[PDB]
Structure formats: C-alpha cells, structure tokens
Symmetry: C2
Subunit: 504 residues, 2 copies
C-alpha cells in the first residue's frame, strides 16, 4: 500500500483537505450572523465536543482499514461490523465524496477562471453608489456560470468557464495520478505555505484599507463584538456545530481515505490534532480577517448585516471583486484572492476524489493510473449535470453534501464506538499515538458526540427536508434520479468487488 | 454454455423475438400510408435484399461468438476484428438493447394493464359521433400513462399502471431467471401457439363486423388496393426497408445473443429463414387482417386515411378499444386483443433483456440469477425516466432504437462481410446449414445490403436528426445525458471485463 513519506507532508495534506473556501468565506459569514464574538462560544464547544472527537475517529477508521488494504467505507464498515447492511451503509460513505467531487471541482474551476481573468485584468470596470459597483460584477459572474436569463432552469457556462473546468480537472488529475506521496503530499508541501503566504499578505493589505465609509478595523469590530443574546437561539448552536463539521470536512470520506495511507502504528492523535489546529488558525485568524473586514471597510458597518445575510458566495465572488475594483492595486489583489481560493479548493478536491480512486484500487484492483482516469471520467461526465442544470449543484450539496455527511458522521460514531466496541475503538485511536487522547474524551465520544450529531441531524432535518421535498422545482428529481443512480452504480461495483474477492 | 433444447423451441423463440406489436399495428399503418397493396413491392424487395441477408448475418455472428463463450458484441466484434475500436463499436451493440429494454418493458406493461382492465370490464362506456366514442378511451389511456395536463413535461402514471409495470418486470424475470431452454424456450413453445390462436380468433371475429359505416371487407379493400404511384416516392422505400428492419428486430442485439446459444455447427440458415417466415405470416396475414379492417369496418373507408395517419399507437390503444366498446362481446374482445399484444411484447422483451444478461454472464462471470436480477434492477431503475419524463421514451427510441440500430446493422454488414472477410463470413453462415444460402446472396450481402442500409441511414438521417437536434424541448438533454451515461457505464464494464480476463 501507498504511504505518506513524511509526518509534515501527511499533516499538510490533511490540513489542506480541511482548509477550503469555507475558511475565508463561510466561517466569517456564519460568525457575523450567529453572535459575532459570541459565536466562538458554541464554536469552540463544537470543536471540542464534535469536531476533534469525530476527526480522530475517522483517522482511526482509515488507518485501521488501511492496514487491511482498504481505504473506503464499504470495506471498512464491513471490517467493523461483518454484516451486509454494514457494506450498504458503507456504500453511502463512498457515494458522498463521489457526489461532492461532482460539483466541487466545478466550483473550484470558477476560482481559477476568476484568478486568470483578474490577473490579466479582463474584468469589469465601474463606474458612485453600491449597486452601481456590484451589478457589473454580478453580471460578470452570471455570464461566467450562465445563470438562466429566462424561465428554463438551464445554465450556459461561458466557453472560457468550460475550458477552465477542463484545465481544473487536468490539474487535479496531474496531481492525483502521481499518487499519495509524490502527488498529493508533494503538492501539499508547496500549497499550504503558498496559501499561508497569500492569506497573510491579504490580511495585511486588507487591514490598511480606508474609505469614507469605514476602515478594516470597523470590520473586525462588527465581526467580533459579541451578541450573547443569540446564544439563547438553538439555530446558533446548529450553525456552530455544522460550521465545525464543514470546516473539518467530517463525514465526507476524505479523512478516512487519507488516513488509510498512515502506517498501522503511526500516530494519528497528535497528527490529527495538529491538522485540525492548522485549519482553525487559517479559519479564525486569517479567514476572520479578510473578507468581512474588507467589505465593511468599503461599504461601512451600515451595510454589514445585509452583507453577511447575502451569503458566502456573493461575498467571495461578487462583493470582494467589486471592492477590489475600487481600491489601489485591487485587480492584482483580486488575482491574489482567487489564487488563494483556488489552492484552497485544489488541496480539497484532490482529497475528495481520492476515495473513489482508493476504492477502484483496493477493491477492483485497478492501477493507480486507471483508477484516477476513470474517476476523472466519471466526475467529468457527471459534472455536466451540475454545469447545465440550474440548482443541480444545490440538490447534490444538500443530499450528499449536507444531510448525507451529518447522518454519515453519526453512523461513524455508532459503528465505531458502539458496534465495533467502545474499548476497541479507544485502543484503535490511541495505538501509536505520540500523545494520548485525554481519558475524558472516551465519554465524550461514546455519549456526547453522538448525541450532538443526533440533534444536528434531527432538530435540523425536521426544519429542512420538508421545504426541499415540497417547495422545489420538479427538475430536482433529475438530480435525485441521477445521484440515486450513482448510488446504485456503486452498490454494483461493491457487488463486483465481492464477487472478484470470492473468486480469488 | 447454455443451448436451445429443440429446433422447434429455438425457432419459436426467434420467431417470438420478431413477432411484436409492430406486426399488428405498425405494418398495417405503414402499408396503408405507403401504397396499400403496392407497398408489398418494396416490402418484399426489402425482405429479400435487407431483412433476410442481415438476419442470417446476425445469426452467424451470434453462433460464432457463442462457440467462444461470447453472446454480445463488445467481445464478438473484437473476435471479428481484433482492434480496440471494434470493442467500442461493440459496446454500442449492447447499449442499444439495454436502452430499448428500458422503454420497451414499460410499453409492454401497458398491454397487460389494459388486458386486465378489459377482462374485468373496468373500462369506459360511451355514449353518437366519432369523437364522442374515442375521447373516453383517449382519456382512459392518458390517465393510465399520466400524459401531462399542464406545461411541465412531467408524466404521472396511475398507481395501477406502476404496479402493472412491477408485475410485468416480475413476469420477465420469472422467465429469464430460468434461462435459455427452461425459461425462454419453454415460454416460446406456449406463447407462440397462444399468440397464433388469439390472432386467428381475432381475424375471424373482425371479419364478421358489420356497421352502417362499413364492413371488414371494406377495410381489407382500403388496405390492399394498390396505389402504384407512391412507389415513385423515395420515402416509401425507406418506410419499407425500415419496416422490414423493425419487424425482424434487426440491429437490436437480441438475434445475435439468442443465436449465441445455437451450437457451433447447428444449422442457422433454415432455422433463421423459418423464424423470419413465421414473423412475415403473422405480420402480413394476421396483422394485415385485424386492426385496420376493424377500424374501417366501424368508422368506414371515409376515415380510413385519417385513421392510418393518426398512427399505430392511437390505433392499438385508443381506436380499437373504442371500436370494441361498440360491438358485441367487445370488452372481452378487447381483453383478447391486449392479451395478444402482451404475449407479443413479452416474447420480445425477454429477448431484448437477454443481451445484458449474456454480457454479465459471459464477461463478468455473474451467475444467471445475479445477471438477471442486476439486469432487471438496471432496467427497472432506468425505466423511471421513461415513466416520468414526457418524451423520454421517444428520445431513447430514436437514438438507440432507430438511428442506433440502423447504423449498427450497417456496422454489422461491414465488420462481417468486409473486415472479417467476405469468404469467411460466407462459410460462417453456411456451416452446418440444413440448406445452403443461394450463391447469389453472396453478392447481395457484400454489395446490395450494405448499400441499401447506407441509404436508409443517410438519405433518411439528413431528414431526421436536424429536427430532433433543433426542434425539441430542452428536456431531451436529460435523456441524452442519461443514455450517454449508460454508454459510459457499459464501456466501464467492458474495461472491467478485459481487466478480469487479463488477471485470469
Ligand atoms: C462529453 C459530455 C457531453 C455532454 C454535452 C456537453 C457538451 C459541452 O458543450 C460545450 O459547452 C460549452 C459551455 O456551455 C460551450 O461554450 C461550447 O460551445 C461546447 O459546445
Ligand atoms: C494567460 C492570458 C490568457 C487569458 C485570456 C482568457 C480570458 C478571456 O476571456 C474573455 O473574457 C472577456 C471579458 O470578460 C469575455 O467577454 C469573453 O467572453 C472571454 O471569455
Ligand atoms: C488558458 C485558458 C484561457 C484560454 C481560454 C479562451 C477561450 C475563450 O475564447 C472565447 O471564445 C468565444 C467563442 O468564439 C468568444 O465568444 C469569446 O469572446 C472568447 O473569445
Ligand atoms: C494589492 C497589492 C498592491 C496594493 C498596495 C497598496 C496598499 C496601500 O493601501 C492604501 O493604504 C492607505 C493608507 O496607507 C489607505 O488610505 C487606502 O485604503 C489604500 O488602500
Ligand atoms: C445534462 C447534460 C448536459 C446537456 C446540455 C449540454 C449540451 C447543450 O447544448 C445545446 O445543444 C443544442 C442542440 O445542438 C443547441 O441548439 C444549443 O445551443 C445548446 O448548445
Ligand atoms: C444533517 C445535516 C445537518 C446540517 C446542519 C448545518 C447545515 C446548515 O447549512 C444550511 O444548508 C442548507 C442546505 O444545504 C442551505 O440552504 C442553508 O442556507 C444553510 O447554509
Ligand atoms: C425526470 C422526471 C421528473 C419527474 C418529476 C415529477 C415530480 C414532480 O413533483 C415535484 O417534486 C418536487 C420535489 O419534491 C416538489 O417541490 C414539487 O412537488 C414538484 O411538483
Ligand atoms: C425506486 C426508484 C425511485 C424513483 C422514484 C419513483 C417512485 C415511484 O412512486 C410511485 O409512483 C406511482 C406512479 O406515479 C404512484 O402512484 C405511487 O404513489 C408511488 O409513489
Ligand atoms: C383481477 C381483478 C383485479 C383487477 C382490478 C384492478 C383494476 C383497478 O383499476 C382501477 O380502474 C379504475 C377504472 O378505470 C380507475 O378509475 C382506478 O384509478 C383504478 O386504477
Ligand atoms: C393484479 C394487479 C391489480 C391490482 C392493482 C390495484 C391498485 C390500484 O388501486 C388504486 O389505488 C389508488 C390509490 O388509493 C386509488 O386512487 C385508485 O382508485 C385505485 O383503487
Ligand atoms: C368477441 C367474442 C364474442 C363475439 C361474438 C359475436 C360475433 C358476431 O358478430 C356479429 O356478426 C354480425 C353478422 O353475423 C354482424 O352484423 C355484427 O357486426 C356482429 O358483430
Ligand atoms: C426521473 C426519476 C423519477 C422521479 C419522479 C418520481 C417521484 C415523483 O414523486 C413526486 O414527489 C413529490 C415530493 O414528495 C410529490 O410532492 C409529488 O406529488 C410527486 O409524487
Ligand atoms: C437510421 C435509422 C433509419 C430509420 C428509417 C425508418 C424510421 C422511420 O420511422 C420514423 O421514426 C421516427 C423517429 O423515431 C418517427 O418520429 C417517425 O414517426 C417515423 O415512424
Ligand atoms: C439537464 C440539463 C439540460 C440542459 C439543456 C441545455 C440545452 C438546451 O437546448 C435545447 O436543445 C434541444 C435539443 O437539441 C433543442 O431542440 C433546443 O435548442 C433546446 O433549446
Ligand atoms: N473543509 C472545507 C469544506 C469541505 C467540506 N467537505 C469538503 C469536501 C470537498 C471539498 C471541500 C469540503 C472548507 O472549510 O472550506
Ligand atoms: N445586494 C448585496 C447585499 C447588500 C445589501 N445591501 C448592501 C449594501 C452594500 C453592499 C452590499 C449590500 C447582495 O445581495 O450581494
Ligand atoms: N449546504 C451548506 C454547505 C454545507 C455542505 N455540507 C455541510 C455540512 C455541514 C454544514 C454545512 C454544509 C451551504 O450551502 O451553506
Ligand atoms: N507510533 C510512533 C512510532 C511509529 C510506529 N510506526 C510508525 C511509522 C512511521 C512513523 C512512526 C511510527 C509514531 O507515530 O511516532
Ligand atoms: N420486431 C418487433 C419490434 C422490435 C424491434 N426491436 C425490438 C426490440 C425489443 C422489442 C421489440 C422490438 C415488432 O415487429 O413488433
Ligand atoms: N382523431 C383520431 C384520428 C381520426 C381522424 N378522423 C377520424 C374519423 C374516425 C376515426 C378516427 C379518426 C386520432 O387522432 O386518433
Ligand atoms: N421509431 C419508430 C419505431 C422504430 C424503432 N426502431 C426502428 C427501426 C427502424 C424503423 C422503425 C423503428 C417509430 O416510432 O415509429
Ligand atoms: N448441422 C446439422 C447437424 C448438427 C451439427 N451440430 C448440431 C447440433 C444440434 C443439432 C444438429 C446439429 C444440423 O443443424 O442439423
Ligand atoms: C463541499 C463544499 C460545499 C460548498 C459550500 C459553500 C462554501 C463557501 C464559499 C461559497 C461558494 C460556493 C458556491 C455554491
Ligand atoms: C422497439 C419498439 C419501439 C416502439 C415502436 C412502435 C410499435 C407499434 C405499436 C405502437 C405502440 C408504441 C408506443 C410508443
Ligand atoms: Na476548513
Ligand atoms: Na483545501
Ligand atoms: Na415483427
Ligand atoms: Na415478441
């Protein structure tokens, strides 16, 4: 089996899996909407009670499977629970990252396309008032993605956008096809420092911004002043737990597969902790310091709230571009910003594609080249639904990317700490640990973490699924049909894997 | 390898593959529209110059592949032409019957649902004038299939319709899962005589029909009086060649796979000829005598033309039901009519599903039970697009079922008689023949048949594809996407097959 070459490379790859667009766009928007500085209360709590515990568990599951030649959950789940239903639940854990890859690489491609456009200065140039600066950037984005101009939910990406998607897939493939140590690890070692450098440069540049409407300080102010009254609200705790889940990429399958290239007794306790901490620093220190402070410096605390409510995507792809178009050196700054996002996405998309690659390798015994190419083929083909059908992305992100991962995380907790055995689980996590998990986490993992996740899944799912099932356009069924198809396809491959195994 | 048990069973199964709804609905409509009695000119010509020749070729290809353990075209094409592109063209020949199965079994289910409804008398009862009798039957059908009432191209089959689809799949599976001799062959031996009996009873009953508007004789009159002027028209020759292709099920893959269970030196010349002749008798004698004569007896030669133009589907599923609702014993007659159609479809759907079954068996070494069940799973799942998306059926029938098969037939001609070798082809067809193919067919096969097909593909494709590509609703892309996906899926399975082979 492939293995990480260095401790540092492992950790930077795992950190790269976690550090994505969310660090710089989602966290700051969720913190601003869910109590500002107060949000660090439920956020730090979620980190300690859900994020850390589940992260170690996923590392443990992957290292465990890896020792037996298995990096994906159909096989691993079955190893933890020798039952046909385990294999099936396991399929769900491979379907998630496949479906996510199918929209995420396209999202990633947009950051590359915008970096290129911003680098060469092929961007809009306004001219006044807020909407007069935003609209040209909204149009710029809408033209790139091909947002429907009419009543058909059909998208039409620009040719440039499509070609950039091809290039982005190519770049992912170039990395992946070199494998774990010479591809992913090697890339992480360049990518994480680059990312760090860009983010710091960005934070500095941002902190200098002054306009008649305000300064970067005003932005930090608005972002971080506590609103302790929002803690009363239950949706703030859901937001925090969800933000932790998303930021650490839990339940998505990448951690498990990456951890499957960690050696049998090689530490995961400290390595996992260190990768999580890197993500948290990039998230709260860097991400907390760029996008919102810029937007508030430029638009002023007067529009802070409306800006936060308009969301992470508008913030990263319309509002900041616009702000860059109005500040000194801003076009080049825009390139730096999108370059940052691109490496942030790229370090995660290689991670999210590796599980399908591992599966084909481990279970169907494809060569790495064939596994990477067929995985790229499936993702590339599939992504055409996402590129051309409006809201397809959203439906995949919901069922696989959201409901899916949280339910799957809960499943991970139960299979590992309850079915496999709480004491076996504990020993599996701690074996070879450079440091040991505090004994108190045994109870957190067995009782607290699953309870938490059970609430996130439940209290929340009641408040989401009915809307998605009832208030959506009929075309959602197209995406549902297709991804259910993908689930059936994976079930079939697992069936073939087990037939191939019985033969040999 | 499985083999047919009896000569008779082989022939009745192959005849059952050919004899379908077309015999009783399409042929009579095409003959009435393309010269009446005159139509037998280009029709008999097509039979001799395209239908017979290509049929023998497909039998020869399947028997040939069968001797080497291969019943489907990815493997067989490669055996005839050891080139990667051969395998790929071969994939197309397995994709066709998979896609066709995916809509055809649903069409079949409708005949079963209507037979049941008509048997128990749960049908509409009009009351006057033509539309006043038809409309309740149009509505009856529209309610069953769930034709869109609004502007969304969404279908909503009745629950009854859906359940009947489940039953129909079950019935197909029950037959298929018993395999070639104990399932398909055994069923053919009951089904073909039953079919013959129903058709004869129907012809007799129909010939007795008298109304103030006319008699069955008037119907035969209108149907068979020649219009030799239409032969001038090129589209009449296309219609005839196409009708022959469709009636004999050529290019669809079922003949090749069925023939793969014929023993290495067991005759195919006379057996193939005999199965074709059975289809022709059922088509021109029986099919020519029922549907149109009934419709004209009842509605009168005054509306003969308009009725023919309204098409085979309206004829079989609306107009005849209605006519049955106005004649003595007509409800029970309606049951007999739909029972006839059901067995006609059922004997063909088992044939069209066998290629995917053979592939999984021959190439992935699945057991017959697993191959049948997974094939049923894929067809069942896939059919939901056909059941719920308006015009999906039509798009599949076009690309796979129409363009597909004719192009594939041409491909068969070229690979066999040109690439494999015209003399090797000839010997392959004739080996073990009870009778020998007339020497003159050597030239027909090498020059005439491919020319014919090249024209059907070309002259016609110019006149069809632009309309389908330009004048269709955007939702066609959903079906295109999906069936291209199916093509990619099959390519992947072939890839796995060849990897499994290299390993063993
Ligand atoms: C290989 C998968 C086939 C599915 C059909 C998708 C073909 C993509 O088509 C492409 O779309 C681009 C972006 O809209 C256009 O700019 C280009 O003209 C190109 O035709
Ligand atoms: C490395 C230098 C090459 C970069 C050139 C590729 C970008 C060209 O992109 C162009 O941008 C224009 C302005 O937004 C658009 O109007 C055009 O549709 C086009 O996509
Ligand atoms: C390095 C990647 C950047 C190169 C991608 C450039 C492709 C965009 O080229 C585009 O072609 C379209 C069709 O002719 C034009 O309408 C656009 O204006 C644009 O020039
Ligand atoms: C993006 C890379 C080049 C940008 C370099 C310009 C950084 C200086 O930035 C400037 O700082 C001034 C105070 O010193 C402020 O009044 C202005 O907001 C201005 O942006
Ligand atoms: C969901 C799978 C993607 C399907 C949509 C991508 C291809 C759409 O392409 C479409 O083709 C039509 C017919 O040639 C053209 O008339 C349209 O302009 C459009 O380019
Ligand atoms: C079982 C899944 C629990 C998820 C809890 C946190 C999810 C909150 O994220 C939510 O996702 C929704 C659907 O994707 C979006 O429409 C909302 O805007 C929101 O961001
Ligand atoms: C490709 C075939 C699509 C058929 C879709 C038929 C079902 C239409 O139902 C649709 O379902 C949505 C999602 O639950 C709901 O928001 C609405 O009820 C909508 O009408
Ligand atoms: C197993 C494949 C899942 C795809 C969703 C299709 C579920 C079919 O749903 C069924 O449709 C019938 C016919 O319209 C309805 O009468 C029934 O209520 C039933 O819900
Ligand atoms: C073997 C006896 C059982 C046959 C009963 C099943 C048929 C019931 O079918 C019924 O037909 C009605 C009249 O068309 C419809 O209005 C109902 O929706 C229903 O589908
Ligand atoms: C042997 C196969 C025939 C049995 C199928 C009968 C299923 C149709 O049953 C249907 O249920 C619907 C939902 O409650 C009703 O609206 C219809 O009127 C009908 O009764
Ligand atoms: C469908 C099975 C039962 C049908 C039996 C009735 C057959 C007799 O049919 C009758 O023949 C008469 C002349 O003899 C005609 O005038 C009428 O059209 C009538 O249909
Ligand atoms: C192309 C794959 C088939 C998808 C369509 C079959 C399922 C459509 O079912 C739909 O579900 C909606 C949400 O629950 C309901 O509101 C609608 O009434 C409808 O039944
Ligand atoms: C390469 C394929 C050649 C086909 C020649 C005969 C086909 C004539 O059949 C045609 O099929 C069309 C599309 O399915 C239908 O829309 C027309 O009504 C017509 O029946
Ligand atoms: C599921 C995603 C569907 C995206 C479809 C986008 C292409 C829309 O183009 C469509 O193509 C049809 C067939 O060629 C043509 O009849 C029309 O040009 C139609 O507009
Ligand atoms: N961790 C990423 C988000 C993420 C979760 N799961 C993923 C899977 C693939 C790519 C990204 C992700 C971020 O904070 O931005
Ligand atoms: N219109 C912005 C949000 C917004 C509202 N008011 C503002 C004032 C300033 C800047 C942005 C805003 C968007 O949807 O993306
Ligand atoms: N659906 C979320 C993003 C997301 C994906 N997976 C998640 C898991 C947990 C929380 C959020 C997410 C959004 O659109 O904002
Ligand atoms: N568990 C110890 C020692 C160890 C065991 N196997 C390893 C493989 C690689 C590196 C270290 C180790 C550690 O991680 O440090
Ligand atoms: N031979 C059938 C039509 C047909 C052609 N190919 C098929 C494939 C499956 C089922 C039926 C068919 C008929 O005349 O009615
Ligand atoms: N309206 C019938 C065809 C038709 C036209 N005129 C007629 C007169 C009598 C019977 C049928 C017809 C259909 O579309 O199905
Ligand atoms: N598409 C034809 C039926 C058909 C399917 N395959 C064919 C091959 C040849 C001729 C006709 C067909 C129709 O709707 O009428
Ligand atoms: N070719 C001869 C004899 C023959 C060879 N192999 C066979 C297998 C089965 C039946 C007959 C045969 C025939 O078909 O009659
Ligand atoms: C697995 C990734 C899901 C995407 C969630 C959003 C992340 C924050 C940046 C906004 C851009 C995303 C486009 C919908
Ligand atoms: C392979 C079968 C294709 C269907 C062609 C039509 C056959 C004649 C009867 C009409 C009913 C079919 C519903 C579209
Ligand atoms: Na993160
Ligand atoms: Na990343
Ligand atoms: Na036929
Ligand atoms: Na048949």
């Amino acid at each position: 089996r492939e293995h990480w070459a260095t401790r540092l490379g492992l950790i930077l790859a795992m950190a790269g899996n976690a550090v994505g667009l969310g660090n710089f766009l989602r966290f700051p928007v969720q913190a601003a909407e869910n109590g500002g500085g107060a949000f660090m209360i439920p956020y730090i709590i979620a980190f300690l009670l859900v994020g850390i515990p589940l992260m170690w568990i996923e590392w443990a599951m992957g290292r465990y499977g890896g020792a037996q030649g298995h990096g994906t959950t159909p096989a691993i789940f079955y190893l933890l629970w020798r039952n046909r239903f385990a294999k099936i639940l396991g399929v769900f854990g491979l379907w998630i990252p496949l479906v996510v890859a199918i929209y995420y690489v396209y999202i990633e491609s947009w950051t590359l396309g915008f970096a290129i456009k911003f680098l060469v200065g092929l961007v809009p140039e306004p001219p006044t008032d807020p909407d007069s600066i935003l609209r040209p950037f909204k149009e710029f984005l809408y033209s790139y993605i091909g947002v429907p101009k009419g009543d058909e939910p059909i998208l039409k990406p620009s040719l440039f956008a499509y070609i950039v998607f091809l290039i982005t897939m190519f770049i992912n493939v170039s990395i992946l096809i070199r494998g774990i140590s010479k591809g992913i690890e090697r890339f992480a070692k360049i990518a994480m420092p680059t990312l760090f450098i860009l983010a710091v440069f960005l934070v500095i540049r941002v902190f200098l911004l002054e306009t008649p409407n305000g300064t970067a300080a005003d932005g930090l102010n608005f972002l971080w002043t506590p609103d302790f009254e929002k803690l009363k609200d239950p949706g703030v705790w859901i937001a925090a737990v969800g933000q932790i889940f998303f930021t650490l990429s839990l339940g998505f399958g990448a951690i498990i597969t990456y951890a499957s290239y960690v050696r049998k007794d090689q530490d995961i306790v400290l390595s996992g902790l260190t990768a999580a901490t890197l993500n948290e620093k990039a998230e709260v220190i860097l991400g907390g310091s760029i996008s919102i402070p810029a937007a508030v410096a430029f638009f002023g605390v007067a529009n802070a709230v409306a800006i936060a409510k308009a969301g992470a995507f508008n913030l990263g792809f319309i509002t900041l571009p616009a702000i860059f178009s109005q500040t000194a050196g801003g076009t080049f700054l825009g390139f730096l910003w999108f370059f940052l996002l691109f490496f942030a996405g790229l370090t995660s998309s290689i991670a999210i594609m590796q599980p399908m690659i591992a599966f084909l390798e481990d279970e169907l015994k494809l060569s790495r080249k064939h596994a990477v190419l067929w995985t790229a083929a499936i993702v590339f083909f599939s992504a055409h639904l996402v590129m051309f059908l409006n809201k397809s992305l959203d439906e995949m992100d919901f069922w696989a990317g959201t409901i899916g991962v949280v339910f799957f995380g809960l499943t991970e907790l139960i299979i590992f700490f309850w079915i496999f055995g709480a004491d076996k689980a504990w020993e599996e996590i701690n074996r070879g640990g450079i440091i040991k998990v505090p004994r108190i986490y045994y109870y957190v993992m067995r009782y607290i973490t699953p309870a938490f996740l059970a609430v996130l899944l439940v209290v929340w799912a009641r408040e989401y699924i009915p809307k998605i099932m009832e208030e959506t356009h009929w075309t959602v069924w197209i995406t549902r049909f297709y991804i259910i198809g993908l689930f059936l396809f994976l079930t079939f491959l697992v069936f073939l894997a087990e037939r191939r195994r019985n033969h040999e």
